[PDB]
Design a protein around this nucleic acid. Structure first.
Ligand code: NI
Length: 165
DNA sequence: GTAGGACGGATAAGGCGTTTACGCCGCATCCG
């Protein structure tokens, strides 16, 4: 049984980790499109800012900032996993709920954005963060945020990742 | 501050039915 309490703060920024139940799945990748589509549908109905996001074949990590006066990432995640569950007609694919962490300062924010873009490399998919197309890294390189050839240390602070067994 | 199917009580999908424009019921997934 879990014990965490959602940290709700209006206008807040947070980091999240949502895992597919099945380790060998590649569904988030294969059906990249339905996923993309789902987040779009929900974003429209309950506005938020995607600070950053990666999708891996079987889980994703991301950072959101919610509108002023709005603390409700819960609904937003509930709808997202719902649309995508609907769209691909598969049942019980998600690890229930999700990992949430409130970002209170700029340093922490950057560690978590980096963590996001480094992730494909930590997970062994690619040797270079720009090799992975399934993220906002390229969106961010396309403003003057990150050099396309960016690299960074692979770190291990606890972050909602599935247990490595 | 903190997971890994707590599980009862919530929200409120979209497919049904007609009033082909909304109401009814109450998904799949949330929280404490
Ligand atoms: Ni990861």
């Amino acid at each position: 049984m879990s014990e965490y309490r959602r940290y709700y703060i209006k206008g807040g920024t947070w980091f999240f980790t949502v895992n597919l139940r099945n380790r060998r799945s590649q569904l988030l990748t294969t059906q990249y499109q339905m996923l993309r589509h789902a987040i779009i549908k929900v974003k429209r109905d309950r506005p938020f800012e995607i600070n950053a996001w990666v999708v891996l074949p079987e889980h994703m990590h991301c950072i959101w900032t919610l509108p002023e006066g709005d603390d409700d990432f819960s609904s937003r995640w509930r709808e997202i996993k719902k649309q995508f569950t609907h769209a691909c007609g598969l049942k019980n694919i998600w690890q229930p709920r999700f990992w949430e962490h409130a970002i209170r300062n700029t340093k922490d924010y950057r560690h978590h954005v980096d963590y996001i873009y480094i992730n494909p490399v930590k997970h062994g998919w690619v040797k270079q963060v720009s090799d992975w197309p399934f993220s906002t890294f390229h969106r961010d390189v396309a403003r003057g945020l990150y050099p396309i050839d960016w690299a960074g240390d692979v770190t291990d602070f606890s972050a909602g990742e599935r247990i490595i067994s």
